Design an enzyme around this catalytic site. Structure first.
Site, PDB file in Angstrom:
ATOM      1  N   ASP A   1      30.426 -46.588  16.672  1.00  0.00           N
ATOM      2  CA  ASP A   1      29.747 -45.510  15.972  1.00  0.00           C
ATOM      3  C   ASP A   1      30.714 -44.976  14.944  1.00  0.00           C
ATOM      4  OD1 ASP A   1      27.388 -45.691  17.457  1.00  0.00           O
ATOM      5  OD2 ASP A   1      28.250 -44.424  19.034  1.00  0.00           O
TER       6      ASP A   1
ATOM      7  N   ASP B   1      15.626 -51.956  24.202  1.00  0.00           N
ATOM      8  CA  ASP B   1      16.441 -51.146  25.101  1.00  0.00           C
ATOM      9  C   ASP B   1      15.774 -51.076  26.478  1.00  0.00           C
ATOM     10  OD1 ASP B   1      18.431 -50.722  23.214  1.00  0.00           O
ATOM     11  OD2 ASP B   1      17.653 -48.791  22.550  1.00  0.00           O
TER      12      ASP B   1
END
Ligand code: NA
Length: 223
Positions: free
Chosen positions: A124, A7
């Site tokens: 998600d 990330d």
């Protein structure tokens, strides 16, 4: 597949949910991921995700050029231009976010132009009280229906509500290649997902934390 992942905030490797700072050498990190046998890599441009005008194209160009394996990149991909820009940077697949939830006709268009092998839908998933698989900010099933006519192939699933979900959905949708993200803390979590039908496992945090090496993850997963 083991899919190692970094990330990025600016030039900086991070842990998120921001939590921890691990330096400014994403390239040697990635290259060592590759040396150990990773077949796919995964970047999230958090700077671009915060604001797309600050998409770190030059950075991502460099990172993708520095390795000789496909790279998928996500983070604030919400227009066709962004997808083209990322591809133009060398990216092998673009990871699309909540837009694919909110704007199906647009995103269907992206599929029709770029093709499904170039796109990954990131979802998600919440299992609610009732036991419906819902898709965060609409059910999983609904989404899969919306995008089957345009050849949907790659979904990145983060469960935010573990093996059994993946077992069921991988069984229900044999035409979708699922990627699990999150829930990895040690080599045993990798072992756990092994026979579920899941096709690719996103591994991030565990690697930075030194629980195991990519070679070990691969040894595990590839039995
Ligand atoms: Na692998």
């Amino acid at each position: 597949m083991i899919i190692p992942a970094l990330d990025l905030i600016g030039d900086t490797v991070v842990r998120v949910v921001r939590q921890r700072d691990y330096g400014n050498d994403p390239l040697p990190r990635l290259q060592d991921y590759a040396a150990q046998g990773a077949e796919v890599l995964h970047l999230v441009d958090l700077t671009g995700a915060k604001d797309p005008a600050k998409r770190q194209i030059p950075l991502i160009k460099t990172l993708v050029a520095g390795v000789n394996v496909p790279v998928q990149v996500g983070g604030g991909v919400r227009t066709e231009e962004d997808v083209a820009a990322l591809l133009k940077a060398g990216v092998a697949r673009v990871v699309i976010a909540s837009t694919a939830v909110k704007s199906p006709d647009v995103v269907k268009g992206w599929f029709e132009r770029f093709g499904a092998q170039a796109l990954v839908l990131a979802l998600d998933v919440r299992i609610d009280e009732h036991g419906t698989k819902q898709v965060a900010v609409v059910s999983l099933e609904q989404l899969v229906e919306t995008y089957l006519p345009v050849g949907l192939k790659h979904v990145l699933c983060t469960d935010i509500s573990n093996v059994s979900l993946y077992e069921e959905v991988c069984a229900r949708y044999p035409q979708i290649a699922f990627q699990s993200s999150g829930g990895i803390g040690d080599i045993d979590d990798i072992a756990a997902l092994r026979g579920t039908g899941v096709r690719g496992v996103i591994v991030g945090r565990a690697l930075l934390e030194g629980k195991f090496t990519v070679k070990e993850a691969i040894q595990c997963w590839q039995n």
